[PDB]
Design an enzyme around this catalytic site. Sequence first.
Site, PDB file in Angstrom:
ATOM      1  N   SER A 122       0.815  -1.231   0.000  1.00 44.78           N
ATOM      2  CA  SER A 122       0.000   0.000   0.000  1.00 44.78           C
ATOM      3  C   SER A 122       0.857   1.294   0.000  1.00 44.78           C
ATOM      4  O   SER A 122       1.715   1.403  -0.864  1.00 44.78           O
ATOM      5  CB  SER A 122      -0.986  -0.067   1.172  1.00 44.78           C
ATOM      6  OG  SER A 122      -2.061   0.839   1.009  1.00 44.78           O
ATOM      7  N   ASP A 239     -10.420  -4.293  -4.313  1.00 44.24           N
ATOM      8  CA  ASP A 239      -9.707  -3.403  -3.416  1.00 44.24           C
ATOM      9  C   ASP A 239     -10.317  -1.996  -3.486  1.00 44.24           C
ATOM     10  O   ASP A 239     -10.235  -1.354  -4.535  1.00 44.24           O
ATOM     11  CB  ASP A 239      -8.237  -3.383  -3.838  1.00 44.24           C
ATOM     12  CG  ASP A 239      -7.317  -2.704  -2.822  1.00 44.24           C
ATOM     13  OD1 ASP A 239      -7.787  -1.754  -2.105  1.00 44.24           O
ATOM     14  OD2 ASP A 239      -6.121  -3.031  -2.813  1.00 44.24           O
ATOM     15  N   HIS A 269      -8.082  -5.325   0.253  1.00 43.36           N
ATOM     16  CA  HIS A 269      -6.785  -4.655   0.240  1.00 43.36           C
ATOM     17  C   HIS A 269      -5.616  -5.409   0.820  1.00 43.36           C
ATOM     18  O   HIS A 269      -4.529  -5.422   0.204  1.00 43.36           O
ATOM     19  CB  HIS A 269      -6.917  -3.304   0.963  1.00 43.36           C
ATOM     20  CG  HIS A 269      -5.710  -2.442   0.825  1.00 43.36           C
ATOM     21  ND1 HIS A 269      -5.191  -2.118  -0.418  1.00 43.36           N
ATOM     22  CD2 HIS A 269      -5.012  -1.772   1.780  1.00 43.36           C
ATOM     23  CE1 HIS A 269      -4.151  -1.318  -0.188  1.00 43.36           C
ATOM     24  NE2 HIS A 269      -4.014  -1.066   1.117  1.00 43.36           N
TER      25      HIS A 269
HETATM   26  O1  LIG Z   1      -2.799  -3.741   6.823  1.00 44.02           O
HETATM   27  C1  LIG Z   1      -3.145  -2.580   6.634  1.00 44.02           C
HETATM   28  C2  LIG Z   1      -3.821  -1.776   7.715  1.00 44.02           C
HETATM   29  O2  LIG Z   1      -4.730  -0.800   7.173  1.00 44.02           O
HETATM   30  C3  LIG Z   1      -4.204  -0.053   6.149  1.00 44.02           C
HETATM   31  C4  LIG Z   1      -4.612   1.259   6.016  1.00 44.02           C
HETATM   32  C5  LIG Z   1      -4.055   2.041   5.018  1.00 44.02           C
HETATM   33  C6  LIG Z   1      -3.154   1.494   4.098  1.00 44.02           C
HETATM   34  C7  LIG Z   1      -2.516   2.427   3.121  1.00 44.02           C
HETATM   35  O3  LIG Z   1      -1.307   2.576   3.153  1.00 44.02           O
HETATM   36  N1  LIG Z   1      -3.290   3.119   2.259  1.00 44.02           N
HETATM   37  C8  LIG Z   1      -2.688   4.071   1.309  1.00 44.02           C
HETATM   38  C9  LIG Z   1      -3.486   5.379   1.265  1.00 44.02           C
HETATM   39  C10 LIG Z   1      -4.958   5.135   0.909  1.00 44.02           C
HETATM   40  C11 LIG Z   1      -5.796   6.424   0.912  1.00 44.02           C
HETATM   41  C12 LIG Z   1      -5.295   7.606   0.110  1.00 44.02           C
HETATM   42  C13 LIG Z   1      -5.498   8.902   0.578  1.00 44.02           C
HETATM   43  C14 LIG Z   1      -5.108  10.000  -0.176  1.00 44.02           C
HETATM   44  C15 LIG Z   1      -4.508   9.820  -1.408  1.00 44.02           C
HETATM   45  C16 LIG Z   1      -4.301   8.539  -1.888  1.00 44.02           C
HETATM   46  C17 LIG Z   1      -4.727   7.442  -1.152  1.00 44.02           C
HETATM   47  C18 LIG Z   1      -5.540   4.106   1.876  1.00 44.02           C
HETATM   48  C19 LIG Z   1      -4.705   2.830   1.963  1.00 44.02           C
HETATM   49  C20 LIG Z   1      -2.703   0.185   4.274  1.00 44.02           C
HETATM   50  C21 LIG Z   1      -3.286  -0.614   5.257  1.00 44.02           C
HETATM   51  N2  LIG Z   1      -2.897  -1.936   5.475  1.00 44.02           N
END
Ligand code: A1IA0
Length: 295
Positions: A122, A239, A269
């Site tokens: 991510s 996702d 995700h």
């Molecule tokens: O195991 C887990 C635990 O819960 C999570 C929570 C978040 C993410 C993460 O890095 N993003 C990237 C950013 C995403 C939103 C975003 C906001 C603004 C611009 C682009 C994307 C959401 C997802 C990953 C996990 N993974």
Amino acid sequence: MPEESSPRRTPQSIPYQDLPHLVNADGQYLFCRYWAPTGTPKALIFVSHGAGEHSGRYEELARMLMGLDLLVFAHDHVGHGQSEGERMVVSDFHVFVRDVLQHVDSMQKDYPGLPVFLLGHSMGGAIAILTAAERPGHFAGMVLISPLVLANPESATTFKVLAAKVLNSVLPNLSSGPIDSSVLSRNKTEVDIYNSDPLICRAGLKVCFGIQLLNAVSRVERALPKLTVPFLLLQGSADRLCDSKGAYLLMELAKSQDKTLKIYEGAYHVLHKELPEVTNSVFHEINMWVSQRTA
Ligand SMILES: O=C1COc2ccc(C(=O)N3CCC(Cc4ccccc4)CC3)cc2N1
Ligand code: NA
């Protein structure tokens, strides 16, 4: 006689002197993790966690990699887990890339001549892409689990409006809502574990951090035609956080001669913490991919 100040502690009040750590270029302590095999390692692999979480969530993946005779290492990104910094705040997204590079450089001093891989999920996948793109030809390979390439379109459109409003005025407290934990994984036990972990930031995304994630997306897009590093890309078709269109864009625009995409039909995700059929396949595929490139 002057005295040394109170020992520096994690945000959870543990002295850094009691933990593996690294001091970054901004003088911030980063909490570190290491998983080393009993013999001489075949390669090094840095694990790059996602937004709001921390390196402790990669225990099982790291032990699998260590079982392949790789020396696995990680740190909690600034503002996350047991590392210093205001929670979920970063002066610029590049701080995360700079810090991964400092840790990789430090490890390569202790283990010279070893190939180095990156594993990122991510946001941590976006960091891994930008890290490899900063140093073309330096990394042996990259493993990306649902990397942040393209955000969910509907979610990004709502956020971009909120971002332009913060960029025009002074609103330091403005935040979007928190992530709907149910979209993380179809595995309800893993959703519950995520909601129970005190090291996870489950607060709303601050608009300043969201702007840095928007910067990450913009920078990843520009970095893709520069990417030559071998990579394995794992992506769930359902996702709601990192749009599957991003994984197809990465396969199309990267210049890498060795690129592989695996789609998990109906998966959410967090692929490495999804239904056992998905998770077992994710671990096996990473195992085969890294084993083939470290043999
Ligand atoms: O195991 C887990 C635990 O819960 C999570 C929570 C978040 C993410 C993460 O890095 N993003 C990237 C950013 C995403 C939103 C975003 C906001 C603004 C611009 C682009 C994307 C959401 C997802 C990953 C996990 N993974
Ligand atoms: Na060193």
